[PDB]
């Protein structure tokens, strides 16, 4: 059975992932950011909407609750096409096949972002600005996709002027430089770093929660001690306590490495293809497997890539 | 080797199917409720009072699409949540199909109140129809929808209409407002999932039949739930479906291919529609479990569930 590897390139925006994943293609497609979904297929202009709203509510023109309803459904139209994408590769990912000193790939997936990222991190980065309910927040999490074995997820290491000054220059059509924003996303990514590596440790949140391996003060469920999820003795609903377990399920099989920023496009296109020998492989589930995803990922490319 | 039983009694709002099912269970059987506490203090506050008032805004011209599928398209999330977790912790439990039709009585039967379909698609789809959410938002839930765990029995019922409204005219739901017109696309909307899942089974193809637009014979795909995706928002010039919203009909059809969709009549007597469903349970498919002390965790999870969303 041939092999497969997929790479989720990952992380806070405006650190120059694509600008360094294009350098690496132009055995290997590239999946690129749904752009015009974004922007055309799936509304109109979402990202425009979306900081739009943070400032109406950073300058007091709306409330709350009302910026609350326009974050969490966009986050719907932000996520889907990562959403289809994974359901329809679900059933040709195989199982593990003896990644790292085994064989090179048949054939090599760099998605730009996984489903986490809008199911998980940036709703997360919302809440964590008045913009989102932490319900809803768990909302999310609770529709997070089984992990497929082979996930490998690459984070990036950027300093932050350094990322103040790349994100100022590649700003995405709507967008508003918001500091806060940055901040606030690349907690949460650094968080979901610790996490990962809490759980892959032997890390149990709920024997933690009444506060080697990370300490859980510095992982996700940080953020879940928020006076709405709680009883009125503090008891956390179990409604989100197995939210929750989805989460540290879901997380712990994930496959994570680390892309440091600071450097030249040739520089990062170089290391991300250094990481890929540590990358877990799969076996395509059939022979027809393998052409089928390339045509997904050039259909998807072609559709939505903008 | 225990096994476990799985129903779900889905189907329009105001037939009877609480009633029923408790009946059922007076009749071992665990029922998991409807988590109304999760939907009017838990997860947002009075949601059903908002999305009945916001169609309602929308309707008398109060509200504009955007405005109103923007706070429709937010309720649909939280009332979802509940089933979505359950699901997500269920399913590690959930082992291969055993069967009923002339196989051993189960170690445990959970009466589901709905299934996570109700929130992810039946719903969300009524209201597309009733112009206060969005085809591509239904699609986007649609590729949320979680994978279909084996002896998925549905449970969908029936009432003639005339009935069916003057049984909604009378239970007052907190929050609820009489709205005919939301009645009816819910009806359609369980009418055509009933037949999605039939024509799906009967080897029946959407892109096949896209062109044209068992428990009986094979139906029209123009009487499948496809056919509410033939909308110019999801239309490329070229005329045929973008790809995005192909996909995510690709996968409505590979999760409810697999489900067991049963009918039981609520045009009778209480006791009778109890007695009804007694009876379509003989059979319905069985699943093995995983680990043998899945029985006392679903058992204790199912009853929690109960204990904390449920009555309100
Ligand atoms: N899912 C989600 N993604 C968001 C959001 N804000 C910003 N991004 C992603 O960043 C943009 C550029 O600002 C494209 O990379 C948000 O609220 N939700
Ligand atoms: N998810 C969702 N559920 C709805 C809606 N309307 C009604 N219900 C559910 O019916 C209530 C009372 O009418 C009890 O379940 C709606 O728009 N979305």
Redesign the interface.
């Known amino acids: 059975m041939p092999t497969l590897l997929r790479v989720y390139i990952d992380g806070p925006h405006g650190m120059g992932k694509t600008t360094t994943t294009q350098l690496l293609v132009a055995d290997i497609v590239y999946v690129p950011e749904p752009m015009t979904?974004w922007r055309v297929?799936?509304?109109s202009e979402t990202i425009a909407n979306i900081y739009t709203t943070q400032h109406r509510l950073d300058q007091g023109e709306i409330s709350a609750g009302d910026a609350?309803?326009?974050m969490?459904?966009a986050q719907?139209?932000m996520?889907?096409?990562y959403?289809?994408?994974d359901?329809?590769l679900?059933?040709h990912i195989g199982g593990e096949a003896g990644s790292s000193h085994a064989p090179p790939p048949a054939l090599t997936l760099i998605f730009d972002r996984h489903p986490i990222a809008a199911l998980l991190c940036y709703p997360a980065a919302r809440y964590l600005m008045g913009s989102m309910?932490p319900?809803?927040v768990?909302?999310?999490v609770?529709?997070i996709p089984?992990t497929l074995p082979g996930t490998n997820i690459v984070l990036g290491a950027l300093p932050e002027d350094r990322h103040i000054d790349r994100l100022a220059k590649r700003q995405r059509p709507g967008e508003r430089l918001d500091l806060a924003m940055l901040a606030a996303i690349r907690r949460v990514y650094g968080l979901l770093a610790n996490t990962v590596r809490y759980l892959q440790c032997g890390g149990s949140w709920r024997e933690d929660w009444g506060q080697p391996r990370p300490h859980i003060g510095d992982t996700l469920f940080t953020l879940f001690r928020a006076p709405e999820l709680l009883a009125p003795n503090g008891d956390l609903?179990?409604?989100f306590a197995?939210?929750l377990?989805?989460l540290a399920k879901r997380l712990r099989s994930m496959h994570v490495f680390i892309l440091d920023y600071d450097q030249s496009p040739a520089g990062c296109r170089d290391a991300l293809l250094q990481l890929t020998s540590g990358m877990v492989q799969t076996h395509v589930t059939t022979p027809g497997s393998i052409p089928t995803i390339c045509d997904?990922a050039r259909?998807?490319a072609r559709?939505?890539g903008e």
């Open positions: 979904y297929l799936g509304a609350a309803v326009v969490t459904s719907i139209t996520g889907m096409p959403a289809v994408t359901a329809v679900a059933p309910t319900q809803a768990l909302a999310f609770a529709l089984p609903y179990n409604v197995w939210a377990d989805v997904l259909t998807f559709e939505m």
